[PDB]
């Protein structure tokens, strides 16, 4: 999968509400905070005696993930997220396919 | 493992007729459909958009909706111990008018005309159709038609 770095699509920002130029980057999840309620609950439940109190997933089966594109409008700086189909290789702004050239093995 | 995909089993049903491949004749696109029309559903394998499911292939139904390039058709489907009303969106390539209805509307017109003729004449006519009745009595002449006797023939081999 090669996806270009810029994309003219619809913008939902109240300033635009039209097709505008967007900057394309790949989404990456942030660091899990230690103060999210789910994590404060988990740490309290894990303290003391009793061992592991929650399940731990083991049977992984997927070999890929879904790629999320982060599109930022160059005008109002509103973002949009757009997920792609599963792929093993992804790059932004790779060099386009040239059609009809001799391979130089 | 078993396979029950959307077009499974349609190898022959969705084939085009022999020497009938290629472009659709434009008469298919010039027909006019109205809500209440009765239509036969026949999938055209060369038009992949707006296709019927194989269940509705060869079914007849009522038009209930008319859009840019397609009609909505109502079909009754036996599901268990009752019928379910189904609504199928079909591009016009997969649809055709039903001819029995045109015949029936013709009969409506003829019945009205005959009734009016009788009313102007001063009498009453019968408009109900009738099944074929047993034949009446008749006399058969034998002029140049003397009964000719036939017999069963003996067995012969020809191998």
């Amino acid at each position: 999968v090669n996806v270009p770095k810029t994309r003219k699509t619809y913008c939902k920002g109240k300033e635009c509400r039209k097709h505008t130029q967007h900057k394309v980057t790949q989404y990456k999840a942030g660091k899990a905070s230690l103060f999210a309620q789910g994590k404060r609950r988990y740490d309290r439940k894990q303290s003391g005696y009793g061992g592991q109190t929650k399940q731990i997933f083991h049977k992984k089966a997927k070999t890929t993930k879904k790629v999320v594109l982060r599109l930022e409008c160059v005008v109002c700086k509103t973002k949009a997220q757009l997920p792609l189909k599963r792929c093993k290789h992804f790059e932004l702004g790779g060099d386009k396919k040239q059609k009809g050239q001799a391979l130089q093995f | 493992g078993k396979s029950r995909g959307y077009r499974s089993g349609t190898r022959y049903a969705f084939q085009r007729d022999f020497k009938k491949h290629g472009a659709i004749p434009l008469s298919t696109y010039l027909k006019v459909y109205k809500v209440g029309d009765i239509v036969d559903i026949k999938a055209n394998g060369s038009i992949q958009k707006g296709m019927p499911h194989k269940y509705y292939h060869g079914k007849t139904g009522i038009v209930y909706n008319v859009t840019k390039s397609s009609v909505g058709v109502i079909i009754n489907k036996v599901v268990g111990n009752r019928y379910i009303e189904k609504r199928v969106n079909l591009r016009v390539e997969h649809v055709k008018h039903s001819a029995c209805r045109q015949e029936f509307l013709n009969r409506v017109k003829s019945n009205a005309a005959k009734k009016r003729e009788a009313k102007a004449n001063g009498e009453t006519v019968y408009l109900k159709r009738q099944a074929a009745k047993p034949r009446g009595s008749r006399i058969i002449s034998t002029e140049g038609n003397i009964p000719q006797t036939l017999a069963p023939v003996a067995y012969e081999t020809f191998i």
């Binding site: - | 209930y64 909706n65 268990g80 111990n81 009752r82 019928y83 379910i84 009303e85």
Partner: protein
């Protein structure tokens, strides 16, 4: 050890015909949910205007 019958439709039509097979009831006016939104929108106004006109002519 637990091999058993896999599938049959035996006795299934017999069960279906005890109380079926019933056609859905037909009505004079169908529901316009699922009809083209532009047609349905204008049909609303056409019915509204017709009632207003009949309510008018009946006065005179």
């Amino acid at each position: 050890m637990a091999k058993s019958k896999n599938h049959t439709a035996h006795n299934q039509t017999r069960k279906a015909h005890r109380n079926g097979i019933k056609k859905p009831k037909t009505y004079k006016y169908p529901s316009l949910k699922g009809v083209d939104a532009k047609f349905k929108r204008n049909h609303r106004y056409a019915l509204h205007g017709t009632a207003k006109a009949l309510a008018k002519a009946r006065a005179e």
